[PDB]
Amino acid sequence: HQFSSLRTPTGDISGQNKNNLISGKATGRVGNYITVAVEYQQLEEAIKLNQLE
Amino acid sequence: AVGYQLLLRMLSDYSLEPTPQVLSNAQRSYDALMTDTLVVPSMRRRGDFPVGQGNKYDVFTSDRYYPGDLPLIDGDIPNA
């Protein structure tokens, strides 16, 4: 919050034009999926690749 | 091959009997045709046959037992 002031030379001015209270927001959300997919013959892959690592 | 088979099926129309040389040629052609198309299926493992510890079985390598004829279950259509 931020405020602004007034410049007057009198003190018994208890009734005047005051400030205002405005509340803001900053909204965060989720994005799209990060997906990588492979299709392949698992037997041919496992011919020479242990544990698919 | 097809020509000799058709000739053997058609001689009876004119009532002419074949000859040993024609029969041998037809046999050789049919044998070559059959040779060019051979399947000789290789039998697969039973399904309850265990897989030894040498084939390291894990979630991402192989299951404890050899895969078989059983179709994978969809989850809907539970009964066949």
Residue at token pair 């097809």: B2
Helix axes B2-14, B20-36, angle to 10 degrees: 140
Query: What are φ and ψ of residue B65, in 5° steps?
Result: -125, 150
DSSP annotation of B70: P
Listed resolution, Å: 3.7
Asked whether the beta carbons of residue B56 and residue A51 sit closer than 8 angstroms, the reply is yes
- Check if the beta carbon of residue B27 is closer than 8 Å to that of residue B7: no
- Structure-token pair, residue A31: 């994005």
- Among B55, B80, B49, B53, smallest CA distance to B67 is for B49
Question: Looking at chain B, which residue has its C-alpha nearest residue A51?
Answer: B61
- Check if the beta carbon of residue B51 is closer than 8 Å to that of residue A42: no
| Residue B72 near chain A (CB below 8 Å) | no
Which one-letter amino acid corresponds to residue B10?
M
Asked whether the beta carbons of residue B60 and residue A46 sit closer than 8 angstroms, the reply is no
Dist. CA B44–CA B67, nearest whole Å:
9
Give residues 22 to 61 of B whose Cβ lies within 8 Å of A. Answer: 56, 58, 60-61
DSSP annotation of B44: P
Distances (CA, A) of B73 to B57, B70, B78: 22, 9, 7
Instruction: Count CB neighbours of A17 within 10 A.
Output: 5
B8: helix, strand or coil? helix
